[PDB]
Write a protein that binds this ligand. Structure first.
Ligand SMILES: [Cl-]
Lengths: 241, 243, 240, 195, 235, 244, 231, 250, 111
């Protein structure tokens, strides 16, 4: 039974190492969510600092890949940082060679192709991570593209990743079934972040303090993460209505 | 089964058992700690005196990278040395190209990526060490701890080896009782105490204390070993606290 | 590159891959070599399971390495082509660098060296081939007959056989071949070579190939009718 | 080296090559054979830079002999000449080209025809009734243009060849120490020991 | 399966230990060192009477002052001999002198452990390297596939080695002559050999300072065999 | 390390056989039957396509018979993809020879070259062998008309008539029975089709389940012509010989 | 058990069995003792023979004028490692005009051995080494294990029955360290130390091997009648 | 490091089977149904856009891909394997043909190059076979319209019409009854939509179906005017609206 | 253009007696018309009772001597502390010099 150790086909036409890489994705027990506004793309993720000895500022699963592209990772941090370093290198190389900023969907495809190679070549293992890329693209506008260990990728209106992804996914599905539009009809990114947090609270059924969340925001020509105090201001506005 | 026989193989759990077995080698090693202070960091390590024939103060365990970073580790000592040699190459190439000495967070990722690379193939073995390291850069003091999986985080205090639980408990008290912070000279004293308290887990053989530190005020942001009177003062403080 | 050690020692001190290569030789068609006073004859079995064969174009069992040296074999046919090609290249390479054709002993030593190299090199398996190498050294009238095997050992023989049922024909040669007085003529040498194959072959029709090599690059292959005359004369004397 | 001539008559090819070898200001040898038998019915003469000539010829010889043993068959003069041309055309763009000009005289046993090929160091091949390399043609081609017929006998070919050598000996400043003559026909290759 | 360079739980390399078993199956080779020279003798062991025994070359010249006898998978020895001859002549090129026997032996033994996953396995042959130099005089070495070499006053390798070594234990002394050593090799070879010893199935050789390395003729050995028979019948 | 997962494709069995070569031959025995018959005035190549469909575009299809050059063709039995790798190599070798010597490559030399490539995969590299058996039909001015076969072992042999693929045992017996040395192409065509018609696993032999080719000196004067039969032409020869 | 097939595999308890098996080869090897004072450093080695006709396997190797070692285990591996030391000592002299520090020599051996314990295909070294030397910081003694671990010591012993000699040195620590400016007495202490590891056999003239290095003493090896003085 | 898997991972079993190829074909069987039909004046290829989530924008995932202006491709099996094959197929059309001959390759030769890549993954060291079957439709001047299937083994066959994946057995039977040699392109599209409806469970509209044609030259899609010989691509992907219009006349 | 060679002047002299030998050299080191040093040793004791001097381009001379001294050291390691004879050293030096046949050590050497 060595067909379960390396990435070759089992009699059922399955790749067990790819399937077990999907299971490593939930090892951190963290849930992430991504939504699109009119002018922005917001990504939020749970932040858990279990040890008091940890420096909480260094605990993060959100990465600034380029000025325009942000990436949140679901999976163990070593593989997350491996992917992050590669995506940063690829984004920079793209700009040098082709004279313009790498689009979010093109980077997603590139990382997805690299993942596909690990599913076909035996000596390389899959990375146990799901990568969610976000930006405000100059051609396509607000953009969410997600990659997984199978080498699969697709664009999203909104998305969710983690152990409780289904609860969050259905919550978002039901909202877009009402509004009948592919985004959050809101002017400011501040209110889009408030929407994202509110709907995660409703879906998971947990309240959040400023240190329980981690937020990334993509606007035209820049992606940036929010500080704890910026998130607190967001939590206050939610509670006051 | 058979998933634990080869490195870089995911078990049905999604776990890399070979990395988890490397952790067992770390847990078998001697105790080492790190303490972040007001303007720097302090490192300390337990050195087991296997025999009287060991020359005191000669078998140095703590290693310097560049001139501003200190490294200590628990587990397979040769694996730690290999990692520090790489760290020194990474630090040299950074300074060669960019002129400025390598920042601590930047240095942390260089080690992290290298250790993580040894979990990607069956043709290599994971590192049998957890490494505590850090120092002072342009943005201030930083302390890190790096595991066999390639996982690392920033720390206020860090501990690894056989007496890590005892150490961690002591570190947690300091964080609670000193929210405003701890001075460099205090951190050296506290580091000595914690190693002495953590020595209850290795109480069969007697040991030798080794301490180092980087501080903006006390060492001009350079890594130095704690020697002579300052070391003895810390030993006396430590011996007073256990009695 | 593929570096896997395929030929390795076993607890009892055997290299099984080299020994299994000898089993491939045991499966191969019988080949025999007999040296007379002024000649060497190479006999070869052709299995008659394959009819409708085109004997004009089918690879002959005996191969010229140079104008004065020949090589026959038993074992895997495809493997033998690689050794023959290498031997032929070395023969021209020797003439080019030393200005003398190879001696039979030198050529044998080279082919044996190639076989040996394939028993302790990574990523390769041994040749499933044993060879009989025969000829006459330049400006020498003493016959030469050597044997090689997958392990890479080689030695000189007054007469020798290899391949399937070689145990039987060797038994025949050991009692029939006299060292003090070897086959004085070509006839006697060919007759003894055909007789030895008739112990094993089955029918004496197109199953026996004979190649006579004489001094000074005089090499000829006997035809079906010429061999058939030997087969006829042998059995007529046997009816007594 | 210097002078190599060739002529194709009715039933044979005749090659004439000088005997001299010069180092510095001294003639070291006056009996040098500037030729190699490639196969029983194919002869190649050569001329060019010192050392390169013999090395190239012997390298070609080894390759044709290897082919003969492998296939138990003699290549046609045309096939050999093409192989040689490719090696020279390959050589001219190398780091250090082989500076060798050749004539290939062969008798094709299949077509029962003599054949002469002239190939220079660049890999320039031409089939000819008579040929030469270097300055040899400047003196001899006018005689050959005048006297040559395709139905000439081997003896008439040798007489016309003597006239060419006599003209060379008269008008060349260069003492090439006579020529070795070889004939290639259906029966193989032989040397004319008195010329 | 398992690595080629793997250690056993006892601290031995599996492959090296297995190659030693192959050497035990090889034909007997004996070497005796004296102050008048070193004698090397081998069992030829022809597999058939039609095999021309003089083509069996188990004793080999490395240089004029160094000889070599082999036992085991004798085909493996050819590249070792080639290296030894190259090393011997190359040192003469670089230093205008004969090479020391120990240094030659060390050069051969450096090849031994160059195997892994370099060659794919250890050598399956042991060598008795005998020679003479000005510094250490007459010497006999035993080169193994482990990369280890011991110097010996007398040594036997091959199938009848432990029986022959016990006999060499009793017989050898520091005042042996060359003639005495020759008869002693023949005596012990005759004892351990399956077939009856004669000039055709056994071979002698020696290395002296004056004449260098010499393989003995079958006529010369035949006389030494006859001389042996008579002296054993003398008591 | 990686050793754990190595199947070791190039090793002997205890009996002295090459596992992968033997198993490759087992694969080939399930492939469609291909037959070659050599006559005095030409060569016939006949082959059976495997269980086809009505929606398969036959006139543009090629799975059995391939052209190596103007003088030489091959019939395939086994993995078609593996065969195309080798076929393209052989086409290149023939052109290399023509460029070097300015003469068309002798049939045997081409066959030996391909057979040497197959051999290499059984002795070194650690890769699986090519699961292909060829029948080579060709002409040159040395030996005239020639038939050869090669298999995954890299061994090749010459034939007057031969079959590869499925039911070769039955097919070879039928060919050995009716074949004669003074036979002609038109007779050989009939023998090839009759043999397939009796050995086939299908219910009936039809035009859409066949590929057919001839190499004839039936070209205007001293020269050779290759004829790859079209679907309609295979349908006509089936009626002519009296099979349909 | 299932985790001892190669050096690239940790066991479930975090052990490397191939390295431990390499360590076992040292225990089978013949005993060798190392000890130093403030002025000199001494190696003492019990050489082993195959039989009575055979020579006694050499145990001590010179690396430089100021440095050398003794071996226990696979002798060819000691030759590879000692050759590496020779090159490194020599690189330091040719490039920096600097005698290689004994401590730095230990660090280089550690790193060389380590690479063989983490990579697939290779194997650990099957030999233990005791390195002595005299540099700018005085006399030194190092113990090398093929796991990579190198330790600086006042005295030690490795090989079969080495525990007896190691206990003796642990008692004599305060005495032999003070033997300054007296090479003969320091050797005596080493010969007396290695004697605690002997059973059945005793120290003969071609059995014993001694080496010494010090303040005004280049690394020299004593064999044969040169050690009869100490028997 | 180094790729130490220099040996084949696909090998012959005692029965003569190449296991990894068979298992790759099993993965193709599990895949979503796709089909191809050849008409007299064109070719049609079609498949279902099986959306993994309703939040996912299925327009961004293209199952039907342009390889050259006159050649298109669709698949069944593992999507990621298909995506990288399309990248390689597009590139090989340039490197091994267009940069040599100054024109795009004919369908059969591009198929041959794709087939070669898939065969090599079946024999080369340290790789598994591609887990896809391709349907490649195309047009070229001298061969006209053509439709090819390519399997994990590297084998390829020309088809008048065919289907691969989930419900291929039923779909091929449906196509046999409807296909003839006189079909116009619009008739083939109609048959393609009928055939594809049988294998689809849920929603059946322009947003859940992906369909492209190889037909007449499209000068409106060329992007420039001025060169008479350049008349535009024959490959065209049908819009969501264009599909829905033909579903009313269904 | 960069000239890798130079001329540091100097002169050396070797004379062989019946049971002794001398190797003498001046101690002046120069470039062009300038004096670099009035005392720069040029003749060296290389061990094993051998003395050596490489005169010409000082950089190449120092490199050669340094390599020969190194060769003596490795001759002891490799051949059981055997003494390197003067004839063996001479032959060894020939190979050190010819290793650079196409970019020579620009020195005239005496031992
Ligand atoms: Cl890509």
């Amino acid at each position: 039974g060595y067909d379960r150790h390396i990435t070759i086909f089992s009699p059922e036409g399955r790749l067990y190492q790819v399937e077990y890489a999907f299971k490593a994705t939930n090892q951190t027990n963290i849930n992430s969510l991504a939504v699109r506004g009119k002018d922005c793309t917001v990504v939020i993720s749970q932040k858990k600092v279990p040890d008091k000895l940890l420096d909480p500022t260094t605990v993060s699963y959100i990465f600034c890949i380029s000025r325009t592209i942000g990436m949140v990772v679901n999976g163990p941090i070593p593989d997350a940082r491996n992917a992050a370093l590669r995506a940063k290198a690829e984004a920079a190389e793209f700009r040098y060679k082709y004279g313009y900023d790498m689009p979010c969907d093109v980077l997603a495809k590139r990382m997805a192709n690299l993942s596909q190679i690990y599913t076909q070549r035996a000596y390389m293992r899959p990375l146990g991570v799901i990568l969610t890329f976000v930006s405000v693209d100059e051609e396509l506008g607000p953009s969410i593209y997600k990659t997984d260990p199978a080498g699969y990728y697709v664009g999203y209106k909104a998305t969710a990743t983690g152990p409780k992804q289904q609860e969050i996914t259905t919550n978002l599905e039901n909202h877009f079934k009402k509004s009948k539009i592919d985004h959050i009809n809101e002017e400011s990114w501040e209110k889009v972040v408030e929407f994202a947090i509110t709907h995660m609270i409703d879906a998971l059924g947990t309240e959040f303090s400023k240190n329980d969340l981690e937020v990334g925001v993509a606007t035209k020509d820049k992606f940036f993460t929010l500080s704890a105090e910026n998130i607190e201001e967001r939590l206050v506005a939610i509670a006051e209505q | 089964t058979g998933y634990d026989l080869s490195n870089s193989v995911f078990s049905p759990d999604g776990r890399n058992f070979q990395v988890e077995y490397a952790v067992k080698a770390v847990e078998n090693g001697t105790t080492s700690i790190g303490i972040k202070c007001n303007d720097g960091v302090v490192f300390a390590v337990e050195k087991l005196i296997t025999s009287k024939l060991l020359v005191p103060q000669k078998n140095v365990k703590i290693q310097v990278v560049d001139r501003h970073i200190g490294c200590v580790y628990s587990g397979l000592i040769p694996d730690g040395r290999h990692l520090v040699n790489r760290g020194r190459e990474e630090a040299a190439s950074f300074k060669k190209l960019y002129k400025t000495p390598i920042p601590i967070p930047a240095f942390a990722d260089r080690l992290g990526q290298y250790v993580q690379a040894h979990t990607l193939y069956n043709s290599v073995r994971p590192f049998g060490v957890s490494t505590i390291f850090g120092g002072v850069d342009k943005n201030g003091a930083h302390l890190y701890m790096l595991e066999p999986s390639g996982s690392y985080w920033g720390y206020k205090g860090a501990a690894t080896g056989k007496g890590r639980q005892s150490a961690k408990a002591e570190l947690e008290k300091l964080v609670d009782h000193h929210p405003e912070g701890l001075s460099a000279r205090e951190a050296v004293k506290q580091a000595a105490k914690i190693i002495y308290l953590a020595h209850e887990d290795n109480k069969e053989k007697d040991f030798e204390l080794e301490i180092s530190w980087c501080s903006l005020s006390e060492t001009n942001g350079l890594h130095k070993f704690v020697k002579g009177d300052l070391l003895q003062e810390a030993i006396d403080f430590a011996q007073k606290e256990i009695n | 590159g593929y570096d896997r050690a395929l030929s390795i020692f076993s607890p009892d001190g055997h290299i099984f891959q080299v020994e299994y290569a000898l089993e491939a030789v045991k499966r191969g068609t019988c080949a025999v070599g007999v040296k007379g006073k002024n000649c060497v004859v190479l006999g070869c079995e052709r299995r008659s399971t394959l009819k409708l064969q085109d004997t004009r174009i089918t690879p002959s069992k005996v191969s010229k390495i140079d104008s004065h040296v020949v090589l026959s074999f038993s074992g895997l046919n495809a493997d033998s082509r690689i050794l023959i090609e290498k031997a032929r290249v070395e023969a021209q390479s020797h003439r080019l660098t030393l200005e003398d054709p190879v001696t039979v002993e030198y050529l044998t030593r080279y082919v044996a060296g190639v076989q040996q190299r394939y028993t302790q090199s990574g990523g390769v398996r041994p040749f499933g081939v044993s060879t009989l190498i025969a000829g006459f050294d330049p400006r020498d009238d003493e016959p030469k007959l050597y044997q090689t095997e997958p392990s890479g050992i080689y030695s000189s023989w007054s007469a020798q056989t290899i391949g399937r049922n070689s145990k039987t024909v060797r038994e025949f040669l050991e009692k029939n071949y006299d060292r003090k007085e070897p086959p004085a003529t070509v006839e006697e040498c060919v007759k003894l070579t055909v007789r030895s194959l008739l112990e094993v072959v089955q029918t004496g029709a197109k199953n026996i190939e004979i190649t006579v090599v004489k001094p000074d690059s005089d090499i000829v292959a006997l035809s079906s009718e010429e061999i058939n005359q030997y087969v006829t004369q042998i059995e007529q004397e046997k009816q007594e | 080296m210097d002078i190599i001539l060739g002529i194709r008559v009715q039933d044979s090819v005749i090659l004439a090559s000088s005997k001299a070898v010069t180092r510095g200001i001294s003639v070291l040898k006056d009996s040098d054979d500037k030729t190699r038998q490639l196969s029983p019915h194919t002869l190649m003469s050569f001329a060019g830079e010192a050392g390169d000539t013999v090395q190239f010829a012997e390298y070609i010889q080894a390759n044709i002999q290897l082919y003969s043993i492998r296939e138990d068959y003699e290549l046609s003069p045309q096939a050999v000449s093409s192989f040689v041309r490719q090696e020279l055309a390959k050589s001219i763009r190398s780091r250090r080209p082989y500076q060798v000009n050749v004539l290939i005289g062969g008798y094709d046993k299949k077509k029962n025809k003599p054949e002469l090929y002239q190939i220079d160091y660049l890999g320039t091949k031409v089939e000819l009734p008579y040929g030469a390399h270097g300055y040899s043609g400047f003196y001899t081609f006018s005689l050959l243009d005048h006297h040559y017929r395709p139905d000439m006998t081997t003896e008439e070919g040798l007489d016309l060849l003597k006239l060419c050598v006599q003209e060379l000996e008269k008008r060349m400043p260069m003492d090439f120490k006579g020529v070795i003559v070889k004939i290639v026909d259906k029966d193989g290759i032989r040397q004319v020991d008195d010329f | 399966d398992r690595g080629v360079s793997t250690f056993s739980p006892e601290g031995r390399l599996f492959q090296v230990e297995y190659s030693l078993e192959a050497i035990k199956l090889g034909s007997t080779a004996i070497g005796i060192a004296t102050k008048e020279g070193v004698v090397l003798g081998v069992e030829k062991r022809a597999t058939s009477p039609l095999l021309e025994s003089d083509s069996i070359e188990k004793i080999v010249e490395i240089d004029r002052h160094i000889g070599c006898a082999m036992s085991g998978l004798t085909a493996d020895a050819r590249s070792m001999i080639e290296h030894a001859r190259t090393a011997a002549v190359t040192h003469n090129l670089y230093y205008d002198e004969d090479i020391n026997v120990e240094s030659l032996t060390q050069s051969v033994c450096d090849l031994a452990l160059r195997f892994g996953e370099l060659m794919s396995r250890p050598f399956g042959v042991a060598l008795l390297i005998a020679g003479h130099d000005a510094d250490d005089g007459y010497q006999l070495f035993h080169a193994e596939p482990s990369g280890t070499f011991y110097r010996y006053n007398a040594k036997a390798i091959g199938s009848g080695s432990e029986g022959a070594q016990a006999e060499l234990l009793n017989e050898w002394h520091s005042s042996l002559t060359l003639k005495e050593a020759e008869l002693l090799v023949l005596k012990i070879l005759k004892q351990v050999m399956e077939e009856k010893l004669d000039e055709n199935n056994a071979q002698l050789s020696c290395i002296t300072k004056q004449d260098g390395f010499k393989i003995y003729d079958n006529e010369k050995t035949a006389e030494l065999i006859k001389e042996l028979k008579e002296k054993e019948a003398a008591e | 390390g990686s050793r754990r997962y190595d199947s070791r494709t190039t090793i002997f069995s205890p009996e002295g056989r090459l596992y992968q070569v033997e198993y490759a031959l087992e694969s080939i025995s399930h492939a469609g039957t291909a037959i070659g018959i050599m006559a005095s005035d030409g060569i016939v190549l006949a082959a059976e396509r495997k269980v086809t469909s009505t929606l398969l575009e036959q006139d543009t299809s090629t799975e059995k018979l391939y052209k190596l050059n103007d003088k030489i063709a091959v019939a395939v039995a086994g993995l078609t993809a593996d065969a195309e790798i080798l076929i393209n190599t052989a086409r290149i070798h023939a052109q290399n020879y023509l460029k070097t010597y300015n003469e068309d490559i002798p049939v045997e030399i081409l066959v030996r070259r391909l057979s040497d490539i197959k051999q290499g995969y059984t002795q070194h590299g650690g890769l699986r062998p090519f699961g292909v058996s060829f029948i080579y039909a060709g002409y040159d001015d040395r030996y005239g008309y020639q038939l050869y076969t090669s298999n995954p072992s890299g061994n090749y042999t010459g034939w007057k008539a031969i079959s590869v693929g499925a039911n070769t045992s039955a097919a070879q017996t039928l060919l050995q029975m009716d074949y004669k040395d003074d036979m002609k192409v038109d007779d050989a065509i009939e023998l090839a089709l009759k043999t397939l018609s009796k050995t086939t696993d299908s219910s009936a032999l039809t035009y859409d389940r066949l590929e057919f080719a001839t190499i004839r000196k039936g070209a205007n004067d001293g020269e050779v012509y290759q004829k790859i039969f079209k679907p309609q032409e295979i349908k006509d020869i089936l009626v002519k010989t009296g099979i349909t | 058990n299932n985790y001892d097939g190669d050096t690239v595999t940790f066991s479930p308890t975090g052990r490397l069995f191939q390295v431990e098996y390499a360590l076992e080869a040292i225990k089978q090897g013949s005993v060798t003792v190392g000890l130093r004072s403030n002025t000199h450093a001494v190696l003492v080695a019990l050489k082993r023979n195959a039989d009575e006709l055979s020579s006694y396997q050499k145990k001590i190797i010179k690396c430089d004028e100021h440095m050398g070692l003794s071996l226990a285990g696979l002798a060819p591996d000691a030759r590879v490692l000692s050759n590496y030391l020779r090159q490194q000592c020599n690189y330091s002299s040719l490039v920096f005009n600097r005698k290689l520090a004994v401590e730095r020599a230990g660090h280089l051996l550690c790193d060389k051995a380590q690479k063989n314990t983490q990579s697939y295909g290779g194997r650990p070294y099957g030999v233990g080494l005791l390195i002595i030397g005299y540099d700018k910081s005085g006399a030194h003694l190092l113990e090398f294990q093929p796991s990579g671990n190198v330790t600086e010591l006042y005295g030690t012993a490795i090989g079969a029955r080495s525990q007896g000699a190691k206990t003796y040195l642990e008692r004599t620590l305060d005495t032999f360290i003070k033997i300054d400016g007296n090479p003969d007495e320091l050797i005596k202490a080493g010969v007396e130390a290695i004697s605690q590891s002997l059973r059945d056999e005793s120290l003969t003239v071609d059995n014993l091997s001694i080496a010494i290095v010090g303040k005004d003493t280049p690394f020299t090896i004593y064999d044969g009648e040169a050690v009869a003085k100490y028997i | 490091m180094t790729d130490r898997y220099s040996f084949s991972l696909t090998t012959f079993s005692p029965s003569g089977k190449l296991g990894q190829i068979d298992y790759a074909l099993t993965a193709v069987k599990q895949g979503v149904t796709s089909l191809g039909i050849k008409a007299t004046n064109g070719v049609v290829i079609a498949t279902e856009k099986k959306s993994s989530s309703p939040l996912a924008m299925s327009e961004t995932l293209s199952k039907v891909s342009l390889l050259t202006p006159d050649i298109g491709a669709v698949y069944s099996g593992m999507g990621p394997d298909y995506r990288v094959l399309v990248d390689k197929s597009r590139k090989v059309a340039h490197t091994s043909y267009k940069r040599i001959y100054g024109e795009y390759p004919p369908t059969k030769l591009l198929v041959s190059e794709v087939a070669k890549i898939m065969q090599e993954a079946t024999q080369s060291g340290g790789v598994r076979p591609f887990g896809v079957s391709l349907l490649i439709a195309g047009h070229d001047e001298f061969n006209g319209f053509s439709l090819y299937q390519v399997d994990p083994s590297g084998s390829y066959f020309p088809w008048k019409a065919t289907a691969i994946g989930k419900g291929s057995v039923a779909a091929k039977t449906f196509l046999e009854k409807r296909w003839n040699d006189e079909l116009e392109l619009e008739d083939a599209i109609h048959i393609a939509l009928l055939t594809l409806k049988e294998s689809v469970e849920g929603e059946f509209n322009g947003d859940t179906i992906e369909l492209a044609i190889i037909g007449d030259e499209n000068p409106d899609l060329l992007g420039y005017t001025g060169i008479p010989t350049d008349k535009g691509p024959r490959f065209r992907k049908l819009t969501s609206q264009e599909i829905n219009d033909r579903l009313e006349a269904l | 253009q960069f000239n890798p060679y130079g001329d540091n002047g100097g002169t050396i002299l070797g004379i062989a007696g019946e049971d002794f030998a001398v190797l003498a050299g001046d101690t002046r080191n120069i470039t062009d018309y300038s004096i670099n040093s009035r005392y720069e040793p040029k003749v060296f004791d290389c061990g094993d009772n051998i003395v050596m001097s490489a005169n010409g381009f000082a950089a190449d001379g120092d490199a050669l001597v340094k390599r020969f001294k190194n060769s003596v050291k490795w001759y002891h390691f490799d051949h059981n502390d055997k003494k390197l004879s003067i004839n063996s050293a001479a032959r060894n030096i020939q190979h050190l010099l010819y290793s650079r046949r196409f970019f020579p050590y620009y020195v005239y050497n005496i031992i």
